[PDB]
Design a binder for these strands. Structure first.
Ligand SMILES: [Mg+2]
Ligand SMILES: [Mg+2]
Ligand SMILES: [Mg+2]
Ligand SMILES: [Mg+2]
Ligand SMILES: [Mg+2]
Ligand SMILES: [Mg+2]
Ligand SMILES: [Mg+2]
Ligand SMILES: [Mg+2]
Ligand SMILES: [Mg+2]
Ligand SMILES: [Mg+2]
Ligand SMILES: [Mg+2]
Ligand SMILES: [Mg+2]
Ligand SMILES: [Mg+2]
Ligand SMILES: [Mg+2]
Ligand SMILES: [Mg+2]
Ligand SMILES: [Mg+2]
Ligand SMILES: [Mg+2]
Ligand SMILES: [Mg+2]
Ligand SMILES: [Mg+2]
Ligand SMILES: [Mg+2]
Ligand SMILES: [Mg+2]
Ligand SMILES: [Mg+2]
Ligand SMILES: [Mg+2]
Lengths: 225, 128, 147, 187, 124, 52, 53
RNA sequence: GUUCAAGAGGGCGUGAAACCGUUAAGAGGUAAACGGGUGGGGUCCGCGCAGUCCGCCCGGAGGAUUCAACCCGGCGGCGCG
RNA sequence: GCCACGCGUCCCCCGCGAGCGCACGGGGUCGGCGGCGAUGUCGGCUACCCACCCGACCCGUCUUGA
RNA sequence: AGCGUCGGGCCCAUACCCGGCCGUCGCUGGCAGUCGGCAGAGCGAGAAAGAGAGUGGCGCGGACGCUACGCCGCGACGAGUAGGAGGGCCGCUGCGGUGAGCCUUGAAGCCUAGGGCGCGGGCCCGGGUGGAGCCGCCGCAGGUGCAGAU
């Protein structure tokens, strides 16, 4: 016949077209709602301050959920108790990066390797730059580039994670499904730092780069990316 | 009208200079033909700076232009007329090249037939 | 095929696969089965326990032919005869079992290993064990001896 | 530079068979095709086994095949072997079967056919049941070789029921110093 | 059978000719002449061959009749076509297509015919 | 010098054995010279039984 | 294979006679070069005389 | 002067390297010799030294006893005849 | 300023419209050009010699170490 | 152009980043679908599965392709002595088949500032010398590859 089949095949494509559109509009609405979210989150932390000073007290803000680690020195001649930790954090190459949710368990390991890393509390823009520019997923054991949302829906559809934005949301808000969101991400291959380094060997406080430099990590990222 | 090939790409070649053997310059008994030294105290084996190079696989050439002559053709070694009809269908990429011991009077026929088939010949004016 | 052997690839390499601190010298440890008691004591005690020592009674002029005594299990007693003998027996309503001379086929003893199928047999053998005999009786038939 | 060992990255399992015989390779071509173009894992197992050596595809006795079909629920169901089907003398009664195997000896062939059975080849099997439904897979005993007795924790070593290699048993060939309690010791 | 005797031949044939990292075959009814189960001539039931004529001039197309495969004398059937180029390719195209006869070899055979005609035509 | 495992064994190659080797390339010819002598004997004692 | 065809006999002078003979069964037997090759290369070694210094 | 040839002339077929003579070329105070990277000059080669044809189309100019469809004859392929 | 727009029916309160162009879009194309040339000029990596800049201790071996 | 405390700027490693290329490993990945007047050319897509049977209400046309011990696509890696394994259209001398193989219109060997191939082992063409035998492909066997050893 190839008449009824043609008309049927057209209805099938038309259905799948409307479906793809609907997923698009859904995506849009999640993103705008998150913009409203972030704006609110930022203002309130000030409002608490102004009102606290008015009363005369001090507002202590919350401890930071998240830290952005970087391995600064190389592969030659390193204690085996270190090596184990380092390879548990997936820092196999130099100038590699990783996200790490915080707690006593993680922080004691980062203490044990203080001299080899540089960590701190990263900002939202630094999270955007890193994910968008150099996002590469671990799909079927293969380093494949994060260029379309399909590549995410196939793997993470079960957590309602359909796009870069939801991913960002989980990372900044260390939500439920951090383990899966981060283990999905391949260790970040960052380049050598433009401008230079002050002194690789020593701690920040004694004028070096190692160890906790809370916020200045952003300055360092902008110089390395 | 030289015989064009189907494609005449860039024949880049990573290295042109030959791999001479360490100390062929000094002695005669030592030939140019490469031989990897398997000594303990050797330098060349262990890459000292400003020394004879060692052949890695890395020099390997692009697949598309291996055994490719500048014109673009490949060789095929021929002894006689029967072997040209083979090439008659793979005419534009490959070319016959006649063997040394083959005579002159037969060469004449080889070129005459091949000129009918339009097959390019590298050595058509070889004896006279 | 020497072309397949290892020495062809080894041409070039100096010590020809025997190492160059401890070279392939002639008899580095000593010869044969030497130092069995002393400095190869182990190999013997880890892999050949018993090598040393005497045991038993010396028997001088041994003749293997006297003690020739090949055994056969009941597991494969019926194997000796063609199939229609077994078939015709179930046909026999009279219940006359066929006689199997084992000696004819070059087996002497009858051991009692396997399970025997339900149909009587007369077995003319030379020796019998205790369990093979009683197995037959429960089935049926007798154990006719012969020297 | 990265700190990974590259020790065990190469895998040794077989890809293709060492044999040059044509019929085995034609089986291979076929089951490669059905392997990739189907979902059934059955075909992958059959593939693996087609590459394996003589020891690894051992002979299946008839007694073992029979009672494995006597098991309940697998009535009227084709038995599948990669090795050879040898005959058993120590088994009188022979229920009628449906066998598949690369080789079967004449004796077992006669035993089955007079009973009213059936011997399939693989090209017939592919047509009958391509996915292979209604199939009892089987194998012979890999450890059946006499050699495995020789392996393990060494002799002359507490608890090691392990055959030693010996030219000839007798009174005075490895019975004395390490076995009798009298002479020296035993373990 | 065919696949069987393909696996037999592929390597150990006298007609096969290996050199200079190349591999060819000089059988009569091969076109493209490359050692391969598709183009091998002798194997199949239905086999094509496009030669130039016995006399220098002309082209004979050859076909294999499927009846007597163990009797070579009666198997092949030659037939010269001494016309112009275009009508040659029309008649050949029709011979092969409309009979469902080995349509794999369609374009190859065409190309060879044109090159043959080229040859018996005067040289440049 | 025994490494890990083997049949302990006593080969008899200490005597000058490479001297006294009997090679059997004779065989086919020997078979014929027997066969010929047998046919010639039976031809001699014509009607008597061949075997004896 | 199961199928056995009929072969025509030819006269010594080339023409076909009336008689037609059935194919024996061996000709449908399995081909196995690995064996042929192996066998040939062992049997041919026996026809070999000794050489020695 | 023989011989096709003494470019085989009685330790005489072919006649390599080490070594020497001469000729030709180039160069020259940190012994010579080397790798990489370039330049200059020689050397011969390219049988270079006004530069691609191929289908198809459009158009203008020639010519051959020529196209399709049917009839006859033969053959092959296929047949849910 | 809004990725808000049949009618009827459902809830809280008052499965086929076709058509045409643009492009920061699943890895470069021009539907753009110019000079030289038949007896002294063009190309010729390698291979022949020379020059310059940088690099550079003679091989094999035993050896903790050449 | 010294000593102590410091700023900006600036210099390069076979390290790091982006890109090109070789080989290997892994995905035990993909490909027999070249199904053509018996035709209708798809099965990469966020979501366990069918372009499924039925039954009531003019012009004759369509490139390449696949030696499946092949072809093709994806990622990641590459120092190596003593030592082990794989592939060698690397090479030597001889034997059974095979090329209607070559050759006095000049074989082998040898010489070469010629043209070329291969990562390399080595090999092919031109020229000169020489005057009678030689090589390619599939298999087999070995007294089978030199710088050294007073
Ligand atoms: Mg800078
Ligand atoms: Mg030294
Ligand atoms: Mg080594
Ligand atoms: Mg030594
Ligand atoms: Mg030794
Ligand atoms: Mg030792
Ligand atoms: Mg590396
Ligand atoms: Mg051992
Ligand atoms: Mg006699
Ligand atoms: Mg002399
Ligand atoms: Mg001379
Ligand atoms: Mg020389
Ligand atoms: Mg001079
Ligand atoms: Mg020494
Ligand atoms: Mg040392
Ligand atoms: Mg010392
Ligand atoms: Mg560098
Ligand atoms: Mg890269
Ligand atoms: Mg290593
Ligand atoms: Mg390596
Ligand atoms: Mg001469
Ligand atoms: Mg001569
Ligand atoms: Mg020498």
């Amino acid at each position: 016949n190839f008449a009824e089949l043609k008309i049927k095949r057209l209805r099938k494509k038309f259905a799948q077209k409307m479906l793809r559109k609907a997923r698009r509009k859904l995506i849009y609405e999640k993103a705008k709602h998150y913009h409203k979210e972030y704006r609110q989150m930022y203002r309130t932390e000030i409002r608490m301050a102004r009102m606290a000073r008015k009363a005369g007290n001090f507002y202590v803000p919350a401890e930071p959920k998240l830290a952005f680690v970087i391995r600064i020195r190389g592969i030659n001649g390193v204690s085996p108790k270190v090596r184990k930790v380092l390879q548990l954090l997936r820092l196999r190459q130099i100038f590699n990066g990783t996200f790490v949710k915080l707690n006593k368990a993680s922080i004691n390991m980062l203490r044990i390797v203080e001299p080899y890393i540089a960590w701190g509390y990263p900002n939202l823009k630094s999270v955007n730059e890193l994910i968008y520019k150099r996002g590469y997923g671990k799909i079927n054991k293969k380093r494949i580039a994060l260029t379309d949302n399909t590549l995410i829906a196939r793997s993470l559809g079960k957590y309602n994670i359909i796009c870069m934005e939801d991913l960002i949301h989980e990372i900044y808000t260390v939500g439920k499904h951090f383990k899966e969101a981060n283990n999905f991400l391949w260790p970040f291959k960052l380049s050598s730092p433009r401008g230079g380094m002050k002194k690789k060997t020593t701690h920040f406080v004694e004028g070096g780069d190692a160890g906790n430099r809370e916020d200045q990590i952003n300055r360092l990222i902008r110089r390395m990316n | 009208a030289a015989l064009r090939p189907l494609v005449k790409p860039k024949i880049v070649k990573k290295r042109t200079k030959k791999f001479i053997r360490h100390q062929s310059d000094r002695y005669v008994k030592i030939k140019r033909n490469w031989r990897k030294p398997r000594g303990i105290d050797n330098r060349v084996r262990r890459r000292f700076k400003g020394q004879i190079l060692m052949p890695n696989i890395g020099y390997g050439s692009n697949k598309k232009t291996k055994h490719m002559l500048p014109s673009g053709f490949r060789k095929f070694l021929v002894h006689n007329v029967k072997e040209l009809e083979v090439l008659l269908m793979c005419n534009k990429s490959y070319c016959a090249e006649i063997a040394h011991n083959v005579s002159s009077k037969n060469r004449k026929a080889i070129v005459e037939r091949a000129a009918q088939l339009a097959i390019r010949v590298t050595n058509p004016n070889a004896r006279l | 095929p020497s072309r397949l052997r290892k020495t062809r690839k080894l041409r070039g390499h100096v010590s020809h696969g025997h190492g160059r601190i401890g070279k392939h010298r002639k008899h580095p440890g000593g010869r044969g089965n030497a130092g069995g008691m002393h400095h190869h004591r182990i190999n013997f005690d880890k892999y050949h326990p018993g090598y040393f020592g005497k045991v038993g009674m010396r028997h001088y002029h041994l003749k293997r032919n006297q003690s020739f005594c090949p055994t056969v299990n009941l597991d494969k007693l019926w194997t000796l005869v063609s199939e229609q003998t077994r078939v015709n027996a179930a046909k026999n309503k009279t219940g006359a079992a066929p006689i199997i001379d084992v000696v004819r086929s070059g087996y002497y003893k009858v051991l009692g290993k396997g399970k025997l199928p339900k149909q009587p047999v007369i077995v003319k053998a030379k020796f019998f064990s205790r369990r093979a005999e009683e197995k037959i009786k429960g089935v049926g038939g007798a154990c006719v001896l012969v020297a | 530079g990265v700190d990974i060992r590259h020790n065990k990255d190469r895998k040794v399992r077989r890809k293709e068979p060492k044999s040059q015989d044509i019929y085995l390779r034609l089986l291979v071509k076929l089951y490669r095709f059905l392997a990739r173009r189907t979902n059934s894992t059955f075909n992958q197992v059959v593939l693996k086994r087609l590459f394996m050596s003589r020891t690894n595809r051992p002979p299946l006795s008839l007694s073992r095949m029979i009672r494995k079909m006597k098991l309940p629920g697998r009535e009227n169901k084709t038995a599948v072997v990669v090795g050879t089907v040898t005959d058993d003398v120590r088994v009188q009664e022979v229920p009628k079967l449906k066998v598949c195997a690369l080789r079967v000896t004449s004796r077992a062939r006669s035993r089955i056919l007079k009973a009213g059975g059936k011997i399939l080849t693989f090209d017939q099997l592919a047509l009958d049941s391509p996915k292979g439904r209604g199939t009892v897979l089987l194998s012979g005993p890999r450890k059946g070789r006499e050699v495995y007795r020789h392996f393990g924790k060494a002799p002359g070593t507490p608890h090691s029921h392990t055959k030693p290699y010996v030219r000839s048993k007798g009174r005075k060939f490895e019975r004395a110093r390490g076995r009798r309690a009298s002479r020296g010791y035993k373990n | 059978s065919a696949h069987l005797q393909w696996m037999v031949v592929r390597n150990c044939s006298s007609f096969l000719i290996k050199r200079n990292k190349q591999t060819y075959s000089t059988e009569p009814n091969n076109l493209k002449a490359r050692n391969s189960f598709r183009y091998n001539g002798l194997i199949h039931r239905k086999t094509v061959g496009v030669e130039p004529a016995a006399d220098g001039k002309g082209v004979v197309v050859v076909m294999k009749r499927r009846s007597g495969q163990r009797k070579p004398a009666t198997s092949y059937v030659r037939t010269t076509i001494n016309k112009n180029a275009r009508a040659t390719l029309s008649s050949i195209r029709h011979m092969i297509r409309k009979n469902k006869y080995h349509p794999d070899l369609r374009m190859a055979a065409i190309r060879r015919a044109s090159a043959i005609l080229r040859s018996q035509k005067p040289v440049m | 010098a025994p490494s890990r495992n083997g049949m302990i064994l006593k080969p008899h190659f200490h005597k000058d054995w490479q001297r006294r080797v009997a090679t059997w390339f004779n065989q086919p010819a020997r078979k014929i010279r027997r066969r010929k002598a047998r046919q010639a004997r039976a031809r001699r004692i014509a009607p008597r039984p061949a075997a004896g | 294979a199961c199928a056995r065809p009929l072969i025509s006999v030819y006269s010594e002078k080339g023409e076909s006679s009336g008689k037609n003979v059935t194919l024996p069964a061996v000709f449908k037997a399995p081909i196995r070069p690995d064996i042929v090759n192996f066998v040939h290369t062992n049997l041919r070694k026996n026809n070999r005389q000794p050489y020695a210094v």
